[model samples]
Target: VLGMPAVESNMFPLGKQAPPFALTNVIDGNVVRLEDVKSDAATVIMFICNHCPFVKHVQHELVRLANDYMPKGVSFVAINSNDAEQYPEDSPENMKKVAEELGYPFPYLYDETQEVAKAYDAACTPDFYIFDRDLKCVYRGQLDDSRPNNGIPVTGESIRAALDALLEGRPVPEKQKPSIGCSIKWKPSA
Candidate 1:
């Protein structure tokens, strides 16, 4: 019901290397860095927050994909870069709760500094990026053609297509649609 202008993610260059990040995983209080989650096939980095309806809409499918893909050599990590002081639901404590409740198979990191989000040019919640073994970004886009109440099913089709192509040594499509979601809540500048 919140009527914020839905922003689409910036389509950062396809060959751009994944930015280095070292953030805290709220669930286990463990430090998870970009190097730590590198996979033999592909690594998926998701920018999500607790309160965004867009993120909530497809959260279950996200967990399911992690369970299915992680064992197959695709590493996954979700980062909440929203300023929790502004949006308390995205706080570390709540993140821990969400991860536990969902049985998330991957680390749910807290980005207090929000620097990592800026490095990736992430413009909205649920921004997704898939990188190859070399850490070069292959896809940056929506989870699928679905949206909250958009009448389409949340199938993870777009992401899965890119991931499957990468896993099978096929070329991912050149065109990618940006993910649409609420803009990341930036902290007020002093």
Candidate 2:
């Protein structure tokens, strides 16, 4: 099997306008879009793959993050952008399964064309691009230093720190480390 490509930082630069996208949820059979979440909460757009162990390591905490923040008007959305044809485990069926197994507090969507991922400049599983109520990016980086082997805790402190500040009407720190994980599987023309 081909290995995942090199992981990289956010390609769109910080503070760039995230493109709008509408996609179907794998489980609930509902359609969602950027505007849909904005009216009620700040949104965290997660670029995640179903089978990435790095993502798996943080999945539980991700669920917790949503649970804790959703009540405070923070919405979470996970988007799968890998080439499912090439990586079947990352397919929508598995996405549904994973979401069910984990009791995700938000919707998980499929990006079949990879265009949405491109628009968000997602680089890897668990890559995070957080937006304030206005849909402008406020945080773009790793959940923390956590890894399957590194022993870093999956508390999402880095992201939560930003989330807390934003919720309290403070600015997220400008410096951040881009998320590192299994590379996004792209089609040949992608």
Candidate 3:
């Protein structure tokens, strides 16, 4: 979010089927498929990278959220789809280091080809999407109103509210918001 102004995430439509993904987790060196991590209640698939300040601001909440909800049957997976070649800090090795340092409870994957990011129409380094047990997207957008250096605290409230509604058997609110973060570092077009 430094130098470049933040961009809001595209609001992926509700009820759309979640696109599938299979990528290697930075820590375990094992491939993780979307189906393999699907939760009985909900699954959170997020786009993130090592170098984004916006993501750094919310990374702690990411761990806290998963720790709170994973036992309640929500799954979380973070994918770094930034072009690692361009931003070496986002490379798999660094991702593994960050995951370990953060004590991430969920798999932190690397989207080397970035195809999975494209399949989900991700625009930024911190895009978020929530899918129901059936893998239909229920919510898409920001973690919360907080932003890098904003006066507001990072509460993970937006995503938390959505997840709570889903697990409570209530309809997720229709008024979804777009996440603001750095654009995904894309590879040069062939």
Candidate 4:
């Protein structure tokens, strides 16, 4: 939140059912409902902020992971829940710029009401939640150990590990570290 403020996590309780949502795509300006994306093997829902250094830190790999895994039956959708009114850079138009600049293959959705973020219990930019084919919460945590200016290579190991396990017909990792990042910038009344 360069022009706003860093927020904190409203941790979605683990194992909670992901609520369905239909939102506007910042990239295409089209509506994407969860039902439309769920036809794939499973879905990866990522809560990411446009201006958060945490998200920008690994933005490249995040895009790569989405591109690679999506073809393997994992559909990826990124949600930006920051209050656009306060943070103009997080607005839908700028979101399109982020996606285009990164060559993101998946839809980057705008949570105008921020209700979807609340429904999913999204805490921060770069927060990830993976739901299995049955729509059960299987993985919720960080992208990896990388971060902004940490002099670390951005690798989507943590998420890729979970995804590999699921695709290999194995179990999702039991131990997961909750993601740490700049919190969602909520509206004043929100």
Q: Rank the candidates by lDDT, best first.
A: 1, 3, 2, 4
Q: Candidate 4: TM-score? A: 0.91
Misplaced by over 4 Å in model 2 are 39-41
| Pairs of residues clashing in candidate 4 | none
What C-alpha root-mean-square deviation, in Å, does candidate 1 show against the real structure?
Answer: 1.5
Return the top candidate by lDDT.
1
Collision count for each candidate, in order? 0, 0, 0, 0
Candidate 3, residue 34: lDDT: 86
- Computed on alpha carbons, the lDDT of every model, listed in order, comes to 0.91, 0.83, 0.91, 0.83
Stretches of model 1 off by over 4 angstroms after superposition: 1-3
lDDT of 1 by residue, 151-170 (tens): 89888988888889999999
Q: What does candidate 2 score on TM?
A: 0.93
Residue by residue across 57-132, what tens digits does model 2's lDDT show? 8898998888898888888889998999999998889889988988988889999989998888788887988887
| Span of 10 residues, lowest total lDDT, candidate 1 | 181-190
| Candidate 3 global CA lDDT score | 0.91
Query: lDDT tens string, model 4, 7-119?
Result: 44455665667799999998878999998878345688999987778887878888789888887889898999989998899989999997898888999999989899878
Worst window of 10 by summed lDDT in candidate 4? 1-10
Q: Which stretches of candidate 3 lie above 4 Å from their native place?
A: 1-3
The pairs that clash in candidate 2 are none
